[PDB]
Amino acid sequence: QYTLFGTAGVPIRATCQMGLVEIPGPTPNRVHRVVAG
Amino acid sequence: SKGAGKSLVRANLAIHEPPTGKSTSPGGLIKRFPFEFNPAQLSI
Amino acid sequence: EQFVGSGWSFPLRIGPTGGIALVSGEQEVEEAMRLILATAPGERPMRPEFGCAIHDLVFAPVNEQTAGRIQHEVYVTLDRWEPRIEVHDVDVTTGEEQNVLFIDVRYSIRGTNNPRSLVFPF
Amino acid sequence: MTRKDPGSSIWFSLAIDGESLGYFNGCEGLSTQVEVEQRQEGGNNGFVWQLPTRVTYSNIRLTRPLTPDTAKVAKWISSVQTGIQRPTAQISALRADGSLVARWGLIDVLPVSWQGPSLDPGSASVANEVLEIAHHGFTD
Amino acid sequence: MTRKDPGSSIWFSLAIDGESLGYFNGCEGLSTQVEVEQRQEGGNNGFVWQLPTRVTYSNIRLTRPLTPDTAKVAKWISSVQTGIQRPTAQISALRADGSLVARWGLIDVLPVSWQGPSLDPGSASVANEVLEIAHHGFTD
Amino acid sequence: MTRKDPGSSIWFSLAIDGESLGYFNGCEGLSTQVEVEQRQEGGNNGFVWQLPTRVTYSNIRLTRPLTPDTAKVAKWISSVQTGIQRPTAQISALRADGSLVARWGLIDVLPVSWQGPSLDPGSASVANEVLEIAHHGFTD
């Protein structure tokens, strides 16, 4: 969204909305003890 | 128990070139964009 | 709870009888992390992405913006190349006046839930 | 300093050009504002930025005693059907000597409202028609 | 304590820096609000939690007698097209001795409105132009 | 029985703990409200059921003469950037003898607004800074 256009055409105040979505980063490339209970 | 502890930092947007081959991490930086005003609210 | 295996040791010593000694258990994890974090990326040409890229954030200002990017760099690299380790926070404290950036990583082998911090003993 | 010469609020001069509206008798509300826009930095409490955007002039209410020359004003207002004219108006404040303290001017005027006299059998006053005026800028 | 020295609302000094605005004559509305967000804890009845959120500074209305130096203010206001300089103002409260009680200052300013004099042939008073100042943090 | 005359609106005592705000001079609006919820019974004309729901405490406006110790309250308000403190304050009403009629205590205190002095070259009064305050509960 552009508002308050300075003279000679250059915009001055601009509001922009961004929509981001995460890209997965996958592919990162069982001994158990015995207790009395 | 702090790092910089007492400073103000401007949120910046980092743009990276897309990966080319059998890779997943983004490539080298192409343009770093620093904000003029940190966002008022951020929705996740 | 998770198998840790066994292997050689970074500073390798001949041992008690000869050959090269083999280290396992919770101790062995440190050497894997010590190798992973010490070397920059690109040191081994065959495997370029291996090696955490701390040095890309050298001589940056002392801001939590820099410590903010430091946290991410360790998190991805410590997870991508060392899957046996579950990471628990990384602490960036300047210390000794604002000229150096310490990094304190707390971790635990999965399931064992024994909190531990990498020390890097010289 | 000649003991200065500070402005006052009795001596003045009010007039409109073009159509024979003549000289008026009382101004009000002559003002110019700025439409500021407030944006709140997310990470920095303790203040709100005050960014300046545009400037808006407000209307003016001019009053005068009701005189037979009020037919001109109604003719001017009701001329919008067949084409209106924007003359140039002036608003000036003077000291008692008749000198000049600050002379403002209206770049382009336009009628807005005309509140006629408030006729009353009891109140002992004088009819004061009110002619609101639209604005376009200050002359220099 | 030498019989103290409590502040009063007659002795002061109002000024704006930068453009030749000069020293003004009367302030109003100097205030610092703090927005509070009220969350009603559903578990227990008896109050509503008060949590602070940001700090906003309100506008200040400065008035002075209409003097020929009012052309500077109109020049300053109408400079928004070419860019506004934002000097540092000052609001101070004094005692009759001329010593200081508490001096405030405005980090950055911005014109918002300028209500000109209310000319009136009957009422006897001094024409009082009103300049409205946008605000930023407090200096220290 | 004696004559236990009630709290005159003159003798009092107002204070804030913690940050060295000292003792204040005037209070207003000390009030507790509940938000009743009205449900209109469909089959019965004649009243609307009143059911209590929660309790809320309104804000208070404390005023004192402007004294050089006003640097503390301004500092306290601006401390919200780096961490605020809720000290515990009191409001008491007394008789001429200085005994106690009813002593209330604010459980937790949060600044809301600080309407500074209204400087005026003409009005003959004394600057009265107005420090608002956010209630949190009554002590016992």
Automatic annotation (TrEMBL), chain B:
Q: Which domain of life is it from?
A: Bacteria
What name does the UniProt record give this protein?
LysM domain-containing protein
Organism for this UniProt entry: Streptomyces coelicolor (strain ATCC BAA-471 / A3(2) / M145)
UniProtKB/TrEMBL annotation, chain C:
Top-level taxon in the UniProt lineage: Bacteria
Ranges for domain IraD/Gp25-like come to 24-113
Its recorded name reads IraD/Gp25-like domain-containing protein
**Which species is the source of this protein?**
Streptomyces coelicolor (strain ATCC BAA-471 / A3(2) / M145)
From TrEMBL, chains D, E, F:
InterPro entries, per this entry? CHP02241 (IPR011747), Phage_T4_Gp19 (IPR010667)
Which GO molecular-function terms appear in the entry? Answer: structural molecule activity
The record's section on Pfam families has:
Phage_T4_gp19
What name does the UniProt record give this protein?
Answer: Phage tail protein
Which species is the source of this protein? Streptomyces coelicolor (strain ATCC BAA-471 / A3(2) / M145)
